[PDB]
């Protein structure tokens, strides 16, 4: 046990919102996507994050989300995310 609170810093265009997610192992990618959709009024989205190689990589699944979280643990419990419409 067990990943600590993670901060998701999510950019859409020139807006950014930070979401403090208390128990990331207890979350689903579907839940996170839904939060981002509701926040930015988006329907179909692609979300990317900045990985260890400092490249934007899309998260398209629960597994890709879980891997992104493993990285966040090593990087100060935060993820820098970018959202694109469509």
UniProtKB/Swiss-Prot annotation:
Coiled coil: none annotated. Disulfide bonds: none annotated. Changing residue 13 to A: No effect on interaction with SQSTM1. It is found in: Cytoplasm; Cytoplasmic vesicle, Autophagosome; Lysosome; Cytoplasm, Myofibril, Sarcomere, M line. (Microbial infection) Cleaved by S.pyogenes SpeB protease; leading to its degradation. Degradation by SpeB prevents autophagy, promoting to S.pyogenes intracellular replication. Phosphorylated by GSK3A; this phosphorylation inhibits NBR1 involvement in the formation of ubiquitinated protein aggregates. The PB1 domain mediates interaction with SQSTM1. Ubiquitin-binding autophagy adapter that participates in different processes including host defense or intracellular homeostasis. Possesses a double function during the selective autophagy by acting as a shuttle bringing ubiquitinated proteins to autophagosomes and also by participating in the formation of protein aggregates. Plays a role in the regulation of the innate immune response by modulating type I interferon production and targeting ubiquitinated IRF3 for autophagic degradation. Homooligomer and heterooligomer. Interacts with TRIM55. Interacts with titin/TTN. Interacts with RNF29, USP8, MAP1LC3A, MAP1LC3B, MAP1LC3C, GABARAP, GABARAPL1 and GABARAPL2. Binds to ubiquitin and ubiquitinated proteins. Interacts with SQSTM1. Interacts with TAX1BP1. Interacts with IRF3; this interaction mediates autophagic degradation of IRF3. Interacts with IL12A and IL12B. This is Next to BRCA1 gene 1 protein. It comes from Homo sapiens (Human).
């Amino acid at each position: 046990a067990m990943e600590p609170q993670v901060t998701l810093n999510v950019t859409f265009k020139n807006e950014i919102q930070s979401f403090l997610v208390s128990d990331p192992e207890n979350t689903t990618w579907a839940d996170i996507e839904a939060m981002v959709k509701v926040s930015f009024d988006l329907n179909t989205i692609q979300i990317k994050y900045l990985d260890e190689e400092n490249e934007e990589v899309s998260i398209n699944s629960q597994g890709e989300y879980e891997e992104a979280l493993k990285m966040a643990v090593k990087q100060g419990n935060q993820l820098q995310m970018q959202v694109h419409e469509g």
